[PDB]
UniProtKB/Swiss-Prot annotation, chain A:
Highest classification ranks of the organism: Eukaryota, Metazoa, Chordata, Craniata, Vertebrata
Chain positions found as Phosphothreonine: T5, T9, T95, T276
Species for this entry: Oryctolagus cuniculus
Short name of one Pfam family: WD40
Name by which UniProt lists this protein: Small ribosomal subunit protein RACK1
GO molecular function: ribosome binding; translation regulator activity
Gene: RACK1
Residues with Phosphotyrosine modification: Y51, Y227
Domain of life: Eukaryota
Positions annotated as WD repeat: 12-43, 60-90, 102-132, 145-177, 189-219, 230-259, 280-310
Curated annotation (Swiss-Prot), chain B:
PTM per Swiss-Prot/TrEMBL: Methylation by PRMT1 is required for import into the nucleolus and for ribosome assembly. Sumoylation by SUMO1 enhances protein stability through increased resistance to proteolysis.
Localization per Swiss-Prot or TrEMBL: Cytoplasm; Nucleus; Nucleus, Nucleolus; Mitochondrion inner membrane
Entry-annotated residues carrying Phosphothreonine: T58, T59
Parent sequence residues shown: 163 to 227 of 243
Protein's name in the database: Small ribosomal subunit protein uS3
Function noted in UniProt: Component of the small ribosomal subunit. The ribosome is a large ribonucleoprotein complex responsible for the synthesis of proteins in the cell. Has endonuclease activity and plays a role in repair of damaged DNA. Cleaves phosphodiester bonds of DNAs containing altered bases with broad specificity and cleaves supercoiled DNA more efficiently than relaxed DNA. Displays high binding affinity for 7,8-dihydro-8-oxoguanine (8-oxoG), a common DNA lesion caused by reactive oxygen species (ROS). Has also been shown to bind with similar affinity to intact and damaged DNA.
Length: 313, 65
């Protein structure tokens, strides 16, 4: 039966792992961000003595790098940072193409479109904003926006239509359609602020979570509240699987991998159980991302490590 | 704060027997706003200016716009 083994663990950071992402073009790369103010591009050897080595280290920020995302070609890479700026990397030696100037506060969330021509940003400005790849502002959203910090935005894969998700700490999830830039809907739910949201690879769903730590499911186009599940104390990051209908929820002491059909927990990932006391005996898990193979998944922790796992039958 | 939030004056006044010294020291009150003249923070104990809001009535629903 499909179950999990502890694969290995990476090392090479002085700051807490904030995000991880992986391009399906090169699954032999993997990319990471951290509060050591650098994004590290790795070189994955599949030896079990290690599991990878840092290839290069991209440098140049004056505050944390919150979120990071790959290009659809894997030849570019983009970052959002708490210095209020973004950078557009050339992931071959270094040498930033462009830095995006204009925010008054942190840039928390960021995402990179499928056509590689639209780039969004969530900010503690309380503004979602759109960005040309030339590094200028196609649009700015300041009407019908969140009344609190913007937690996470997403581009939605679709048949062709433009839809983007937005969720803030005002305990609401707003869906936006481009070329009118209007509220498609407002979804109400979750007591306490929202941390994260993520969209299905098919794109008709929004799995949302927050302080509540409950996983509520919404319909993108039907606009209906499907159901709610108790996901534990707090869920900081979510990521669907590419080759299954699972959903992997990142809670503090454990990662909870959920089968969706039927609705049940498959397993709970436990890491090293080393004796420590008392407030967070293991480090909290904060980010996670699947590989495109779907065999292996990765995790971000606050001990500066990325723990690897692998599915075993 | 002594440079901002107080003004001080000295004036000598004569009489038929010697001199008398007058001194007046007065403390400026503005902290909410305006002119703006003296700066908005409080001088001696620098206070934390604290607004308040706190409500929730949320329940799950979908409301289409």
């Amino acid at each position: 039966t499909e179950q999990m083994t502890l694969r290995g663990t990476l090392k090479g950071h002085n700051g807490w792992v904030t995000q991880i992402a992986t391009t399906p073009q090169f699954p032999d790369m993997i990319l990471s961000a951290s509060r050591d103010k650098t994004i590290i591009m790795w070189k994955l050897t599949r030896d079990e003595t290690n599991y990878g080595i840092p290839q290069r280290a991209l440098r140049g920020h004056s505050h944390f790098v919150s979120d990071v995302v790959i290009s659809s070609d894997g030849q570019f890479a983009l970052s959002g940072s708490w210095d209020g700026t973004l950078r557009l990397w050339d992931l071959t030696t270094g040498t930033t193409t462009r830095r995006f100037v204009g925010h008054t506060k942190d840039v928390l969330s960021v995402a990179f479109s499928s056509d590689n021509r639209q780039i969004v940003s969530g900010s503690r400005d309380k503004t979602i904003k759109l960005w040309n790849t030339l590094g200028v502002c196609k649009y700015t959203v300041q009407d019908e926006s969140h009344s609190e910090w913007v937690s996470c935005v997403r581009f939605s894969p679709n048949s062709s239509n433009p839809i983007i998700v937005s969720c803030g700490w005002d305990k609401l999830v707003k869906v936006w359609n481009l070329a009118n830039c209007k509220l498609k809907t407002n979804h109400i739910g979750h007591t306490g602020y929202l941390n994260t949201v993520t969209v299905s690879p098919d794109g008709s769903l929004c799995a949302s979570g927050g302080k509540d730590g409950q996983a509520m499911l919404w319909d993108l186009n039907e606009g209906k509240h499907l159901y709610t599940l108790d996901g534990g104390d707090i869920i900081n990051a979510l990521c669907f699987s590419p080759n299954r209908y699972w959903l992997c929820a990142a809670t503090g002491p454990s990662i909870k991998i959920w089968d969706l059909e039927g609705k049940i927990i498959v397993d709970e990932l436990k890491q090293e159980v080393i004796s420590t006391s008392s407030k967070a005996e293991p480090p909290q898990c904060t980010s996670l991302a699947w590989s495109a193979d779907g065999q292996t998944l990765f995790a971000g922790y606050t001990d500066n490590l990325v723990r690897v796992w692998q599915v075993t039958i | 704060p002594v440079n901002y939030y107080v003004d001080t004056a000295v004036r000598h006044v004569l009489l038929r027997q010697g001199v008398l010294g007058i001194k007046v020291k007065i403390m400026l009150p503005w902290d909410p706003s305006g002119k703006i003249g003296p700066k908005k923070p409080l001088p001696d104990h620098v206070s934390i200016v604290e607004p308040k809001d706190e409500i929730l009535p949320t329940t799950p629903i979908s409301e289409q716009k």
